[PDB]
Structures are given as C-alpha cells and as structure tokens.
Amino acid sequence: GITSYVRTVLCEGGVPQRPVVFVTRKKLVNAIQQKLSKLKGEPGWVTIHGMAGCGKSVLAAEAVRDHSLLEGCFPGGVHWVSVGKQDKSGLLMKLQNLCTRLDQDESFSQRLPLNIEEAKDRLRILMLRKHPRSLLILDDVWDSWVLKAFDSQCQILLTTRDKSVTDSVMGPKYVVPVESSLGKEKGLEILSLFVNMKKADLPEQAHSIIK
Amino acid sequence: GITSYVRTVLCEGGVPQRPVVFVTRKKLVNAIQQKLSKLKGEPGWVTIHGMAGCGKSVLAAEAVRDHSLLEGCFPGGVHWVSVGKQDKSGLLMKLQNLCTRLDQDESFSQRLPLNIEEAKDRLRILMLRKHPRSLLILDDVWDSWVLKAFDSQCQILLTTRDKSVTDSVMGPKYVVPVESSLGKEKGLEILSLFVNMKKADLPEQAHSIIKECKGSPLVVSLIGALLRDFPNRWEYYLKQLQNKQFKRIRKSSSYDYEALDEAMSISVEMLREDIKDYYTDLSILQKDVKVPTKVLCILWDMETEEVEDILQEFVNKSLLFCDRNGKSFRYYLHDLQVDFLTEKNCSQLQDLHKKIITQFQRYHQPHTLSPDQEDCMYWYNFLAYHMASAKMHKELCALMFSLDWIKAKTELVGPAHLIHEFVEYRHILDEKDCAVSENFQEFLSLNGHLLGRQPFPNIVQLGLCEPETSEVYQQAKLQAKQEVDNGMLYLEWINKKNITNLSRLVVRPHTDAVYHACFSEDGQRIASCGADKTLQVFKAETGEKLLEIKAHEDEVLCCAFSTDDRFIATCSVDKKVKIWNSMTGELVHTYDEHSEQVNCCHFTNSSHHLLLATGSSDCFLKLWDLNQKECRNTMFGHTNSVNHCRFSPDDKLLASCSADGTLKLWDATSANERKSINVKQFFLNLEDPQEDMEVIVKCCSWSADGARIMVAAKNKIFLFDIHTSGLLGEIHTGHHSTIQYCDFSPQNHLAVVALSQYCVELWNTDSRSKVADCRGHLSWVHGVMFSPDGSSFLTSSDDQTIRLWETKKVCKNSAVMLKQEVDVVFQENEVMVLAVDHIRR
C-alpha cells in the first residue's frame, strides 16, 4: 500500500514507477530493505548483482517503494541516477546533470564545473548540507573510476552486473545477490496478468514454456 | 457552451482554436474525456490514432475544450506541444522552447540546457512543483526516443498515427482508436456549413460526393472549402472523385498538407527499407476484401508465423486495419487507402498481377484446390480477378473455361459469381471467344432453375442439350464419348433443334412457393417473396444473390420497392406491414390497421408525397401517411375484398380495385370519394338466372401516362377512362372462361395474359388481336410483370420458378411444343409419336 506521500517523494527522486505487470519478491525486497536499513548513518555502499535481466533494477525501485524503511530512516529524499556505460567525457555530463538536479534553489553557482572532482565537491557538499539524509541509487555501472567519481562519502548504492566494480571504494560494503530464478507459482501469476485470465483458465501449453 | 474562463486557460495553454467549420463527435469526445478522466492522479499516457486525417487533433483540442472534465479534474493548466517529425537536433530545440514556455516567472536559470536529459529534469521539476496538475498534449510523434525524452513521469498524452510509438514508455497506457468514417448525416451538416445553406436546399449532386468522401473529414473540408470559391462547378468535383484521382483537389488550409494524397505520402516513407517493398505487393488487394492471411503468405512465399508480425507492424502504422475474427485474421483497407495505392503504384500493379499467379502455380493448382483450405474461397472469388490484370488471356482460358472449375465454383459459390465474372471476362479475351462465352451463358440459362438444389445432376449428361456447337457443345460430346466406353449408360438426344424455345434466364430464389415479386424502380434489381415468407432481393443481370431477409411474420402476401428504391414494404397475413430498408436491409417503417389480411401494398409513385395505400380482406382501404405512424385515411368503399392496389400518377388521386369489379378513383387529397366507374361493361345475355353479370376485375393496369385505367376480368380486358368516368377500350380474351391473371404492356400495346392453366398468351391491346403464344411455365403461372424499361418481364410460377423473357421473342410465332398427352406406336427403326395440332386436329 503506497502512501500518497511516498509517491510525492519518489516523483522528486525520479525513480521509474514499477511496470504495471509486476510480481513482488517479498523475501528479496525484505532482505535488501532490512540490510539497506543497516547503514543507519555514516557512509556506506550496497551492491546488488545478477546475470542479465534478473529483476535487479525493479527490486531497487521496489525496495524504496515502501513507506516504512524510507520514511523513518530517510529524512533525505532519494535520488536515482542512470549511469549506464560511459567514456570519460560522457560520465562528466551526468555529474553536471546531477548537480543541476540536486540544486533546485540555484543558490550555488549557475556555472558548472569542468572538472570531475569539483562536481564531486558539489555533490558531497550538497549531500552534506542541502540533503542531509539522502540516498543515491545507481543503475548499471561498468567500471571503477565511475564509482571513484561518485565516491562522495555519502551513501550511494549501485546495482549492477559486475561485483568487482565496488573495489576501489572505501567504507562498509554489503552485497545482496539476485540469482535469476523466479517461482513457478509466480510466473503463472505473471503470465496471467500478461494475458488477463484466472490462472486455471490458462491453457495447458502455458505450464511448459515457463520451464 | 465554452466558459469565458475556459478560453483564458486554453489561451495560456496554446492549443489551437477549433476550425470555424466543425461538427462535434459527441460519442468520441465523450469517450476520450471519460477515459482521459481515468488517470485522476499519478503518471499516465493516452494514445489516440487513425489513418491520416481522421480528426485526430481536433478531437484532442475538442476534448479539452469542455469545462467540466478540465476544471474539476485539472487544476494545472494544459500545455500543448507540436512535436512533428524530428532529427535528434531538431527535437532538442522543442524542449528548450517548452522550458521557456513553462517557466514564465524566469526564476529558474535563464541559461538553457544543452542536454536532453537536463531538459527532462527541468520539465519534471516544473511539472512537479510549478504546475502540479498539468496535462501535456502532443501532436504527431513518429519515433520512440521522442517520448523517451518527454517521459517525465507526469501525464502526457500523445496523439498520432503509429500506435507502436508508446512502447518504450512506462506506466498505464490507454488507446482510443479513431476509425476514419464520419456520418452521412454529419457530413451533410458539414457541407451545409461550408456552403451556408439549409440542408435540404442543398443540390442533388451533394449526396453522392459524400459517398466518395468515405468520412475522411479532411476530404470533406477539402472539397468543402474548394467549393467556397466556385459554387457553380458543383458536379465537376463529383465526377472528379468518380475519377479516383486526388491530385485535382487542393486547398491551402489550417491542416498541414495541400491534399489527401499529400497526407498518405508522408506515412509511406517511414517504413524500413526491407518492409517498404512489401507494402506495394499489398497494393493489389481489393478495396473491400478481408483476405485470409494465407494468400499473403503465398505471394510473399514467407512462413506464416513471420508474415503476421510484419502485418502487425503495419496495423500499428495504421496503414492496414486489423480483423480479429476468431483465429482467422482478415486485413483490409479504407477506400482512400486503396485509391492512394493505385495512384502511387499503378505501373507496378499490372506487372505484379502476374507475380501472384505464378506463386499460386508453384503451390496449389486450381483443380488441386480444396474445400477445407481457408484461402480457397478468395481464390475462387478473386483468383479469377488477378489473371485479368495479368492480361494473360491464354492463362485465363486455362482457368475460367475449365468446366470442372465451374463445377466446384458452383458447388460452394453458387451460379451468380461466375456470370458476373463472365461479363468482365468478355472484354479481357477475344470477340470470337465472346461467342464461346455467349454459348456458356446460354448453357447457364438452364443452370439456374434446378442446378443449385443438391443432387447436382451429372451436368456432363445434362449438358449435351445445347444447339449449334460452339465451344461448350464441342466439349460435351467428347466428354460423353470418354464416359461412354467406361459405362454410365448416357442416353443421346436427337431432337433438340426441333424443340425448346429457350428463355433467357431462370431463377429459383426459394424452395418454398413464391407469392410476389417486383422490379426495382431503377430496374437494376428484383425482389420476390414466398410461402416460407422470407423475401429475397436480387440483381437480375449477373443473377447473383444481393440480399437475404431473415423472416417475415406470417406468410408473405406481397411486397414492393419505394419509388426511389430506398424502401421495401412487405404485406403479410400477420398484419405486420414491415417496411425494411432496401439498402441496409434493416427495418425502417412499420404499420398495421387492417381488420383482415392485407391484399396489397404500394409506395406512392410521387417522389414527394409518401403514402401507403393498402387493400385487405376486410374491404377497407388504408391510405397510410408514411411520414406518420398512424393512417392518413381509412377508406371504406369497396363492397368486396380488394383485388389490387396502385397509386395513380396523379398522387392527389388514388385508384383501387376489388371483386365487385368497379374501379374506384378516390380523392386522396380530400381523403374522400371522387370517382368510381361501374363495371357491367362485360355484357353477356346468358340463360343464367343472375341478371347482368357481376364483373370481378383483378389486375389494375395503368396507361403509360397513367391517365386511364386498363383492367381485365372474366373474358374481357377493358380500358376505362376514370377521368371521364366512362368506358373506352375493351380487349376480349381468348375463347371464354374467367381470367386468373392478366398484364398490360405500355409498349406495343401488348397484353401478356395468363387466362387459365398457365395460358400466358401475348395479345395486343386496342388492336384487340393476339401476337403470339408463350408456352413454358409448369404449375400454371402464379404471376408475371414487365420491366420498367418494358423490354422484358418476369414470370413467377407455382413450380417456384421465375423465367426472364425478352420482349421481342414473344411476338414472333412458334407453333411448336407438342400437346401434353399423346400416344406413340413403335414399329422398329423409326418411332412415330401421336400429336395434336397446335390449332385443330
């Protein structure tokens, strides 16, 4: 049960809304969230990983989707960044864009840094004062210097495919590892939603394809 | 009713004001609006789509045009963006421009983002705080990354042509799909506004052009504006659209294209090169055929699971409408879509027409065709069609000529489609063959009457009956010779040239006895009922089913077309005067008043007045006012049950007949009696105890001007002059008895009269002499009536048979057809048959 307020914080954050055809993974979401709860304060990084298409992002979106962990724990808003895969130049822009996003007031200089580190300063300072209890989520990430760039000393959680990526970084690191499996009961649940029929009404063919 | 405030919000939004010449589409607007209402909160996208120029934008503008949905629902203002079609650079500018538009305060940085995403941030943030309950509308949109850019998590509704576009996006999506149709009532509404006249005041020409329009409001506005300049050249554009070329129609307009052809060209380009070639093949398909997927598989030569998907991509491109009928899918086009194709693909089409056939040859042969296969009927119905375009006449001989192909085609198609094909066939091949086609059509004349039933009698045996030789007879003798050695005990016939005066055509509409039939006023088609009480409506020429009617309560008593053939009254024992539409076939008018079963029904001959005179067994006439549910005037007058009823050419008058025999020229305008000739003119001083004979007139024949009433009864035809209330003509019938049926012919003063026992003699009125005998109906006729041209006449009969006849044939003498009962004595090598002379011994 999403609170109306949760959506309001989430909209500001910019996390994608969950696909209309989804199926909770209560145990997994619960684990990330309880673990996610763990770094109550002081920096910290969380890595989530799986072979391609394991529900890795949706869980990240889903975990924060809940009110309890987020509201009591996280007075700071949540900011989502879609890192992707980047050459050094490309990475630079994302940083400026995060700069513009975070500084809604514009009190900070309209001029944007031409240097990565300076952006790192704007992030750290902004996280430190402007958004004291903020959590940053990342999407993908394929090389370490990238997290080197985002290494603001403020909690950022990166979700990915390589688990090697967060080795440059410093501070407590925890990993929740998503095996690509799912549940036969659940997929039937998912298939039903996809074709809109009582699960039993589903044809004999359906059972086998899920295998 | 626009609120003043609504306009104030709308102006800020920047949506265009609706064109001055518009016509609400209440149902559609209502649907979008109610649906549009649905995403009360939380992101959401709405897609609206149609083939080009379907009113897609105007609806978007119109939906929001209303106060109720917008004001309560949408505290945020509405912002409209005209996306168009864009390269990556072009798209970028629109974003900045939306940035500048939304931030009127300028509190946000004057500097503009050089990066799309940053603009996405400015939009999301601005939508989130600056305009909390805002709705964004988009125009067009041709590629997904575009909506990827606008995907702000805040409701945006995109209106377009492709429905594929909103697949990248996330969140609830609903689509309202606008078919390009419009309403005939509405377009007349639109046309009136375009030319500024009361709708009725609009010229006769106007109705027909709208049929061409096919509801693409773009065409209507396009024609309509075009007319504003030149009110005089009204027909011209009518024939122009009859031409089927849209290069002629052009107007500068708010809309973004000179012409309708102009819009389609824009749609075609986008398709990826591999797809693009395929569409053209799609060009060949009929304007109005839902083809089974398979045939598309055959032309393509590409496997079925694959073939469907490309078509699915088209349907999204809105260039080919879907048909989810069961597992089967029939795709088809708008008349406009088809026309564009020939306009833009015509040179290829003749060439391709030969491509499809060869592929079919690489698969099923026409004899190798089967009943179970889904595609085959298309193959019957239209394969014939492709070969014609192919222009290959020898191949056309390889197919259509084949008698067995005719057999299978007549097995599930019926014997009408082939006749229709043949008319097309005649131009395509050769004049000399045309004779062969003439011989085959002659072979068909014998086919219609009994051929369809079931026990498809071995035609090969019933075929050897034609005369002369031609190509149809030559085929038969050889086939017979082939059959004969094997067996089959075929019996040769040696007298054909000595026997049978063939009728031009025969129809069995019903297994159940016919009760009435009538020509279309246009003469293009005929409707017959029957004992079953179903009525079947048909076009006589090609002789192919053109109408099926499910039932009429009670047994049909008689039926008739409206003067403009727009209606069909149906009399019945129930007393349900069911005036079904003659086109849609759906019921329109209905009436009842008679104390007894109706004797006759007829629409007013006048184009103006709409009345329904109806005789019945209760003797009372009922002069219905067709414009009113209840009768204009009950008319007691006949002392006996009405025999027949017809409107007089003077609609003010209304003649009627009955068993008393006296004519009754009623004054319908006064709803009162005016004239009524007595009929004792059949004087006959017999030894019969009854005094002067009580004449019983049947048919209520009219003069070609209708100024006088021809009639017939007992032993004499009469020609009364109702305007002077006195006798004039008097055509005595053959010998003496009592007439069972009669029919005056306005041409040649002819009188086709069935006296008794199907004695359907051809007499000549006024001259008072017979022209020629007409043997050939079984069951003693049940009825006959001439074509409106008068060049032909139907012959309904008790057998359940309707024989068409040329006017010319009847006049010529034909002393043949031996007498029914004869004794024949056989003395060896020659057999002699006893006969009764056509005249005497």
Ligand SMILES: Nc1ncnc2c1ncn2[C@H]1C[C@H](O)[C@@H](COP(=O)(O)OP(=O)(O)OP(=O)(O)O)O1
């Ligand atoms: N309830 C659900 N949970 C997880 N995935 C779902 C659910 N319902 C549907 N899906 C499908 C649809 C989405 O395309 C996909 C979710 O994407 P996601 O798990 O974020 O992949 P990913 O982002 O880890 O891939 P990549 O490693 O390429 O980034 O799973």
Ligand SMILES: Nc1ncnc2c1ncn2[C@H]1C[C@H](O)[C@@H](COP(=O)(O)OP(=O)(O)OP(=O)(O)O)O1
């Ligand atoms: N009441 C009406 N409703 C719809 N269209 C109308 C009406 N009155 C006139 N028209 C004509 C004039 C306009 O040129 C046209 C409306 O344009 P519209 O339906 O927005 O096309 P469109 O924007 O969907 O085309 P495209 O697909 O090229 O964008 O229809």
Ligand SMILES: [Mg+2]
């Ligand atoms: Mg991801």
Ligand SMILES: [Mg+2]
């Ligand atoms: Mg438009």
